[PDB]
Subunit: 256 residues, 2 copies
């Protein structure tokens, strides 16, 4: 079986002092025994990464961490942009690519996401490749096909072994600011289809190892049902990731 993964996307929240406090609160709140049964990661803003590295390395913490984006390039004249080389030197394990907020606010397309995923892998990072359909598509009853095309586009050009080194996150964008709610069954339908397509793009053996996360609204009341699904391997968590006790509770539920 695939070991569950609870990854906390902090989004654009928490200065470096607050980052230090949150990581220490998570470490204090989550009993050690749970790490054998769940992988736990925090995903802070770029400016918080060195601070988190110091704690994780100095306290030998079992939680891991990552960043929220990276450039498709390794270096150069890209004012404001952050390289996967920098993230690797900071000890990041993960990097989020193609989050729906970047697709909306920064016009990121599937081809760019695929290029970012390849660059992440070049630097030894595990990209968390985010996909998911919007309200109109969901309303058309297209629960699967649009997601499959977006998966194909966002992994375009990756070798089979590279696909075995990514994480996928399904964001039900149709359930963001619309009033709609995505059930655990809804998550299972899409994640099962994602895995079947991964088996085609890579191999059945490889696809059985790839962690596919749910990236809709995850909280203490719903995380158990989500991770209980056959093809859902954890969560890319939003706002709950900012509260150390709540986030620890999510990890504990996912573990047990």
């Amino acid at each position: 079986s695939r070991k569950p993964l609870i990854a906390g996307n902090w989004k654009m929240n928490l200065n470096h002092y607050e980052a230090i406090a949150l990581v220490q609160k998570i470490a204090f709140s989550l009993p050690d025994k749970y790490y054998d049964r769940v992988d736990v990661a925090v995903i802070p803003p770029f400016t918080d990464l060195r601070s988190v590295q110091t704690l994780v390395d100095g306290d030998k913490l079992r939680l891991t961490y990552g960043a929220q984006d990276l450039s498709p390039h390794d270096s150069g004249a890209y004012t404001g942009d952050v390289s996967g080389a920098f993230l690797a030197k900071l000890g990041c394990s993960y990097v989020v690519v193609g989050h729906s907020e970047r697709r909306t606010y920064h016009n990121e397309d599937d081809a760019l996401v695929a290029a970012k995923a390849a660059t992440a892998l070049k630097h030894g990072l595990t990209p968390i490749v985010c996909i998911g359909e919007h309200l109109d598509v969901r309303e058309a009853g297209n629960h699967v096909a649009h997601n499959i095309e977006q998966l194909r586009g966002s992994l375009a050009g990756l070798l089979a072994e590279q696909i075995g080194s990514v994480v996928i996150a399904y964001e039900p964008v149709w359930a963001i600011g619309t009033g709609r709610v995505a059930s655990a069954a809804d998550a299972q339908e899409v994640c099962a289809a994602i895995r079947k397509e991964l088996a085609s793009l890579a191999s059945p053996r490889i696809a059985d190892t790839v962690r596919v996360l749910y990236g809709g609204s995850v909280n203490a009341k719903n995380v158990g049902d989500i991770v209980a699904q056959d093809d859902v391997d954890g969560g890319l968590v939003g706002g709950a990731s900012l509260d150390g006790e709540h986030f620890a509770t999510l990890a504990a539920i996912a573990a047990g």
Copy 2:
């Protein structure tokens, strides 16, 4: 006006390369120069903690800043960095509207103006970048175009706020086109920039605003450029990555 030499590192140098570069600059620049020139480094976001702790821990006279910020204070903007985070890390400056962000990242004058306002709300000094393309320069319309871009990039700011920005002129028309901007070219545009700042505020307030040259700066041209009446220093590119070379630029600007 006290000159300013600000080093835009762009997407270069990891966090322990960042410490070494700052120490190289501090090693290379005699302390007597700081009374005569402000010197700032502008590293990638991921280097800011390392630079902040070095600068604060060793009481360095160098200051630092960041290369971008969100127009928003916080929230659901995955990947983006807030001016609040920059302020808490002791940044003095933040670059807004660099040509690379305008082109690669679809930033228009309105977004630049929003970022400039947000920078000010967090006590940061925005370095507001403007500059015209070759077609505009060839048509002889470079002065007017820069003034319009300035006005658009400062939209919403009132007289008292004008005194808290820095402007940088990037002669984009000379980037990778083979053309070379002269000290005279820099002066023509920077004079027009100051005239517009005076209209948005007053000649006195405009006379406190540093207006930087953001074209190619090296030891052989920096003197002529900073010697110009309306040019107050440089937003330096590649030379900012060599501590010796960068310190030399600061020493020349100090006069």
